[PDB]
Amino acid sequence: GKLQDSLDAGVGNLVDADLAKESAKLQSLQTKQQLGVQALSIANQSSSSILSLF
Amino acid sequence: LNSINTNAGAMIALQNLNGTNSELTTVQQRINTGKKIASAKDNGAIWATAKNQS
């Protein structure tokens, strides 16, 4: 019984993710994608100023 | 001088406009990457140190 517990705990240490760091990465990447969408929206308008020349 | 065959003022205006466009491009690129040193083009030495260190 104790050996089974040790093997299962070893599997858990081998694969399981640490959710505490995941909680910070989630919010950071949400802000990151929002900033990326904003920057791509700004970049899309580069050709709009050309019509003013004519 | 007021010939129709050339227009230097438009030439300097275009030079300044392209310079400002390049500055805005690099700024929006650092906005959507979140990194002053995005690639080896930005600055090779610290970028190399960052790659090895990470």
Swiss-Prot record, chain A:
UniProt subcellular location: Secreted; Bacterial flagellum
Origin superkingdom: Bacteria
Described purpose of this protein according to its UniProt entry: Flagellin is the subunit protein which polymerizes to form the filaments of bacterial flagella.
Subunit structure: In C.crescentus, the flagellar filament is composed of multiple flagellins of 29 kDa; 27 kDa and 25 kDa.
Recorded family membership: Belongs to the bacterial flagellin family.
This protein's name: Flagellin FljK
Source organism phylogeny: Bacteria, Pseudomonadati, Pseudomonadota, Alphaproteobacteria, Caulobacterales
Curated annotation (Swiss-Prot), chain B:
Locations listed in the record: Secreted; Bacterial flagellum
Superkingdom field: Bacteria
Free-text function comment from the UniProt entry: Flagellin is the subunit protein which polymerizes to form the filaments of bacterial flagella.
Assembly with partners or alone: In C.crescentus, the flagellar filament is composed of multiple flagellins of 29 kDa; 27 kDa and 25 kDa.
UniProt record similarity statement: Belongs to the bacterial flagellin family.
Protein name from the UniProt record: Flagellin FljK
Organism listed in the record: Caulobacter vibrioides (strain ATCC 19089 / CIP 103742 / CB 15)
Taxonomic classification: Bacteria, Pseudomonadati, Pseudomonadota, Alphaproteobacteria, Caulobacterales
Location of this fragment in the whole protein: 3 to 56 of 273
